[PDB]
């Protein structure tokens, strides 16, 4: 029951700036969103906010921007005298609650969500005499701050002259109008968006520039109702009036709907009886977090989706990525299965079709990033929407977990063809050596190449830049190697497509570390990831590949074939299933044979060397760039043989390798590029962690995973505090880092609850 879980996350705070950013540019507060709505609310922290839920957070299509600190804050007056209240404020799963206590008057305010654009406040007043009610509010003025401190003296209206915010009174409340602003990286409004306030009683309203006062009289105890609605289009504004009228006409129905929606989340969700109360509350933090990141249809995205973080700088709006989607939907299938199915649908709703007007050669491609606004290339003015690359595909796994939970045959029939086209695209456009095993890469694009299809790249040295074109020139410039750095947009995009930005296995390594690598007898060339282009037989360019085959990528492909075979068998396709089992078999054979080094007893990526080996392997395992989580991807995805897996677990459990203060980080201590505070070269991510625990388990090492889970739990910082879920942990110290309310950490924290956490 909800009440058992008060203040799981700290949702207090009084924003002072539109961008009230923390150190990494994320909104430093944690607003309550639900039902996919495009606004959210914080709790009051003291006297100045008491009587209201401060911090109206607006989701301006692709970003989170605060509107007001105080907005619709109640204050109570009896015989011209202000009533003095003391405050209790708390969140629960699915609602914010605050109570104001005094001698002769008491107020109970409960804020829940009614529709995907409209939240509902219930104000329950209890009094033995008549009362005068004052609500007040004030829009924000100041622009930007970091850690509470201002970065400038810039004002919101200065920065956006065409915003022209205007508070206006109405027949049953007030409203805020917003002018058109197309600040592509900051603030995005249609020109007809609004924040509407509607009340269940007549009120009298005074507007004073960018603040308001509103008054009313009541005879005694009474429960009144208020709607708050952020609406982004003229068409939304019209289509809501009707739904506001039905909420005020029957509030209890909507409270009850929400109230019940959440009891069912918690019921379906909290299914591990071995878990401790502390661990069960971590699971609920994740469910809240995950549900908060759920957005309803909005702009170009016709489905309900889930973003990496609603308070994130670049993860807000309905901006959706396939990678974290699979992880999110795997977890949310175990509690909010409806929206898990929609998240998957949303990612596949812009899958490339035959005859596409941008990339007809990318059929099956699933974009890296979809959002409210399409790219100029597709008709919109969006700067985030991205088809430079996809991301690593665990689609079939994620789709199969929803079916595991629901048993819905029609779900599998819906998805199968979407997945098969994605599978086919990998093999056609990401297998430079037609050898059956994928590379990470990039697509053909404005940013990657000329209109002739000649790959762009910039050569840098000292203060000198030199943009050039063509794979011929690129090859040469690399051979000579007379540059400080070499920027290839297409190669930059394949690091995105890898899922890891700074990774050792893709050649990234700081001066001082590389120097010690050389002093230990390495050559600098060992860290140079070559790059090539994929052409059809017709000579058409299809994209690019890293001249390197990644072991995680091959493992995910094994999974893809594995699950597509089961899906095929379920849909009564025995011959398509036999073919996927065979592809799977060839991938396991290639992974074990080509990517496992018996010497160091672990898996690694392979180079696509200029000529293949005697055993069909495109190259030798890239052991010289150290070990990392990809090493146990074959265990997780089930590609590994019992023996090879036995070896990998030996390494994983070794204190000098991956078994650290927080285990299973993103580079072993023995990696040459290792850095404890480096995101993808040391720091522990919960997904990788969990892939690893599952991997041990699958090959008989459940009790060892349970140990590591207990270590993770005792050591990972803040896990049982009330702070938002973040991205990763330093493996030596436990410090958290990365964006608050990070979905996939929630996805996988939740699954750690479901699989491995227990009473010790
Ligand atoms: O938009 C493509 C990109 O989106 C996500 O990364 C957002 C990044 O945007 C800027 O590069 C910013 O400076 C970074 O700090 C921020 O993480 C995603 O994580 C990438 O994989 C890629 O899809
Ligand atoms: Ca290949």
mmCIF file of N, CA and C in Angstrom, residues 261 264-265 268 294 303-306 329 332-345 402 405-406 408 411:
data_model
loop_
_atom_site.group_PDB
_atom_site.id
_atom_site.type_symbol
_atom_site.label_atom_id
_atom_site.label_comp_id
_atom_site.label_asym_id
_atom_site.label_seq_id
_atom_site.Cartn_x
_atom_site.Cartn_y
_atom_site.Cartn_z
ATOM 1 N N UNK A 261 -4.754 2.646 -9.727
ATOM 2 C CA UNK A 261 -3.669 2.408 -10.675
ATOM 3 C C UNK A 261 -2.370 2.082 -9.922
ATOM 4 N N UNK A 264 -2.098 -1.194 -7.791
ATOM 5 C CA UNK A 264 -1.832 -2.284 -8.700
ATOM 6 C C UNK A 264 -0.368 -2.344 -9.157
ATOM 7 N N UNK A 265 0.278 -1.178 -9.318
ATOM 8 C CA UNK A 265 1.714 -1.126 -9.658
ATOM 9 C C UNK A 265 2.491 -1.772 -8.537
ATOM 10 N N UNK A 268 1.678 -5.696 -8.375
ATOM 11 C CA UNK A 268 2.329 -6.427 -9.455
ATOM 12 C C UNK A 268 3.841 -6.334 -9.341
ATOM 13 N N UNK A 294 7.734 8.341 -17.865
ATOM 14 C CA UNK A 294 6.745 8.010 -18.878
ATOM 15 C C UNK A 294 6.059 9.267 -19.444
ATOM 16 N N UNK A 303 2.949 7.469 -29.683
ATOM 17 C CA UNK A 303 2.749 6.507 -28.593
ATOM 18 C C UNK A 303 3.242 7.021 -27.238
ATOM 19 N N UNK A 304 2.840 6.336 -26.173
ATOM 20 C CA UNK A 304 3.413 6.570 -24.850
ATOM 21 C C UNK A 304 4.838 6.054 -24.868
ATOM 22 N N UNK A 305 5.783 6.856 -24.384
ATOM 23 C CA UNK A 305 7.172 6.425 -24.317
ATOM 24 C C UNK A 305 7.726 6.581 -22.908
ATOM 25 N N UNK A 306 9.009 6.260 -22.739
ATOM 26 C CA UNK A 306 9.745 6.547 -21.505
ATOM 27 C C UNK A 306 11.157 7.055 -21.815
ATOM 28 N N UNK A 329 11.658 -1.227 -20.611
ATOM 29 C CA UNK A 329 10.505 -2.094 -20.913
ATOM 30 C C UNK A 329 10.634 -3.521 -20.363
ATOM 31 N N UNK A 332 9.654 -2.636 -16.682
ATOM 32 C CA UNK A 332 8.287 -2.139 -16.551
ATOM 33 C C UNK A 332 7.238 -3.145 -17.005
ATOM 34 N N UNK A 333 7.674 -4.214 -17.663
ATOM 35 C CA UNK A 333 6.797 -5.321 -17.991
ATOM 36 C C UNK A 333 6.362 -6.023 -16.712
ATOM 37 N N UNK A 334 7.236 -6.020 -15.706
ATOM 38 C CA UNK A 334 6.914 -6.572 -14.379
ATOM 39 C C UNK A 334 6.065 -5.656 -13.475
ATOM 40 N N UNK A 335 5.654 -4.466 -13.935
ATOM 41 C CA UNK A 335 4.711 -3.636 -13.136
ATOM 42 C C UNK A 335 3.767 -2.693 -13.896
ATOM 43 N N UNK A 336 4.234 -2.085 -14.985
ATOM 44 C CA UNK A 336 3.392 -1.205 -15.795
ATOM 45 C C UNK A 336 3.405 -1.678 -17.264
ATOM 46 N N UNK A 337 2.978 -2.940 -17.482
ATOM 47 C CA UNK A 337 3.116 -3.609 -18.778
ATOM 48 C C UNK A 337 2.484 -2.863 -19.951
ATOM 49 N N UNK A 338 1.412 -2.121 -19.714
ATOM 50 C CA UNK A 338 0.813 -1.310 -20.778
ATOM 51 C C UNK A 338 1.859 -0.358 -21.378
ATOM 52 N N UNK A 339 2.466 0.467 -20.529
ATOM 53 C CA UNK A 339 3.417 1.496 -20.984
ATOM 54 C C UNK A 339 4.756 0.903 -21.434
ATOM 55 N N UNK A 340 5.137 -0.247 -20.885
ATOM 56 C CA UNK A 340 6.281 -0.989 -21.447
ATOM 57 C C UNK A 340 6.052 -1.350 -22.924
ATOM 58 N N UNK A 341 4.868 -1.868 -23.259
ATOM 59 C CA UNK A 341 4.527 -2.166 -24.644
ATOM 60 C C UNK A 341 4.567 -0.908 -25.499
ATOM 61 N N UNK A 342 4.008 0.192 -25.006
ATOM 62 C CA UNK A 342 4.027 1.463 -25.762
ATOM 63 C C UNK A 342 5.452 2.022 -26.025
ATOM 64 N N UNK A 343 6.323 1.975 -25.009
ATOM 65 C CA UNK A 343 7.734 2.415 -25.135
ATOM 66 C C UNK A 343 8.400 1.704 -26.323
ATOM 67 N N UNK A 344 8.283 0.375 -26.350
ATOM 68 C CA UNK A 344 8.731 -0.447 -27.483
ATOM 69 C C UNK A 344 8.078 -0.012 -28.800
ATOM 70 N N UNK A 345 6.754 0.093 -28.826
ATOM 71 C CA UNK A 345 6.053 0.567 -30.030
ATOM 72 C C UNK A 345 6.611 1.906 -30.526
ATOM 73 N N UNK A 402 8.003 -9.020 -21.911
ATOM 74 C CA UNK A 402 6.614 -8.572 -21.843
ATOM 75 C C UNK A 402 5.685 -9.772 -22.094
ATOM 76 N N UNK A 405 5.682 -12.144 -19.057
ATOM 77 C CA UNK A 405 4.784 -11.662 -18.006
ATOM 78 C C UNK A 405 3.293 -11.769 -18.382
ATOM 79 N N UNK A 406 2.924 -11.327 -19.585
ATOM 80 C CA UNK A 406 1.507 -11.263 -19.992
ATOM 81 C C UNK A 406 0.948 -12.477 -20.743
ATOM 82 N N UNK A 408 0.703 -12.801 -23.979
ATOM 83 C CA UNK A 408 -0.129 -12.253 -25.043
ATOM 84 C C UNK A 408 0.458 -12.618 -26.408
ATOM 85 N N UNK A 411 0.809 -9.827 -29.026
ATOM 86 C CA UNK A 411 1.950 -8.934 -28.816
ATOM 87 C C UNK A 411 3.141 -9.414 -29.632
#
